[PDB]
Amino acid sequence: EGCPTNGPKIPSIATGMVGALLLLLVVALGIGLFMRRRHIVRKR
Amino acid sequence: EGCPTNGPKIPSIATGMVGALLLLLVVALGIGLFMRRRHIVRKR
């Protein structure tokens, strides 16, 4: 409408962004350890 | 001088958000599997 190229804005929506970002990372980690299904790691 | 940085919308900044969200999830998963196969020394 005026400047589609750029336009940084930090509205109140940040709540969902910050919460989603943190939750997302936690979800990935959990799944990784879950799928692994291993408690006794091998020894070199 | 009045700059709450308000602006609830979907600007071009989405590029970084979408890319960061996907990359973040991938980072968490990798670390999880890495740490799982990585022993943990005591006194750390």
From Swiss-Prot, chains A, B:
It is found in: Cell membrane; Endoplasmic reticulum membrane; Golgi apparatus membrane; Nucleus membrane. Phosphorylated on Tyr residues in response to EGF. Dephosphorylation by PTPRJ prevents endocytosis and stabilizes the receptor at the plasma membrane. Dephosphorylated by PTPN1 and PTPN2. Monoubiquitinated and polyubiquitinated upon EGF stimulation; which does not affect tyrosine kinase activity or signaling capacity but may play a role in lysosomal targeting. Polyubiquitin linkage is mainly through 'Lys-63', but linkage through 'Lys-48', 'Lys-11' and 'Lys-29' also occurs. Deubiquitination by OTUD7B prevents degradation. Ubiquitinated by RNF115 and RNF126. Ubiquitinated by ZNRF1 or CBL at different lysines in response to EGF stimulation; leading to recruitment of the ESCRT machinery and subsequent degradation in the lysosomes. Ubiquitously expressed. Isoform 2 is also expressed in ovarian cancers. It comes from the Eukaryota. The chain crosses the membrane at residues 13-35. Binding of the ligand triggers homo- and/or heterodimerization of the receptor triggering its autophosphorylation. Heterodimer with ERBB2. Forms a complex with CCDC88A/GIV (via SH2-like regions) and GNAI3 which leads to enhanced EGFR signaling and triggering of cell migration; binding to CCDC88A requires autophosphorylation of the EGFR C-terminal region, and ligand stimulation is required for recruitment of GNAI3 to the complex. Interacts with ERRFI1; inhibits dimerization of the kinase domain and autophosphorylation. Part of a complex with ERBB2 and either PIK3C2A or PIK3C2B. Belongs to the protein kinase superfamily. Tyr protein kinase family. EGF receptor subfamily. Receptor tyrosine kinase binding ligands of the EGF family and activating several signaling cascades to convert extracellular cues into appropriate cellular responses. Known ligands include EGF, TGFA/TGF-alpha, AREG, epigen/EPGN, BTC/betacellulin, epiregulin/EREG and HBEGF/heparin-binding EGF. Ligand binding triggers receptor homo- and/or heterodimerization and autophosphorylation on key cytoplasmic residues. The phosphorylated receptor recruits adapter proteins like GRB2 which in turn activates complex downstream signaling cascades. Isoform 2 may act as an antagonist of EGF action. It is linked to Lung cancer: A common malignancy affecting tissues of the lung. The most common form of lung cancer is non-small cell lung cancer (NSCLC) that can be divided into 3 major histologic subtypes: squamous cell carcinoma, adenocarcinoma, and large cell lung cancer. NSCLC is often diagnosed at an advanced stage and has a poor prognosis. Neonatal nephrocutaneous inflammatory syndrome: An autosomal recessive disorder characterized by intrauterine growth retardation, premature birth, fragile skin, recurrent skin infections and sepsis, failure to thrive, nephrocalcinosis, and nephromegaly with tubular dysfunction. Some patients have chronic diarrhea, and necrotizing enterocolitis. This is Epidermal growth factor receptor.
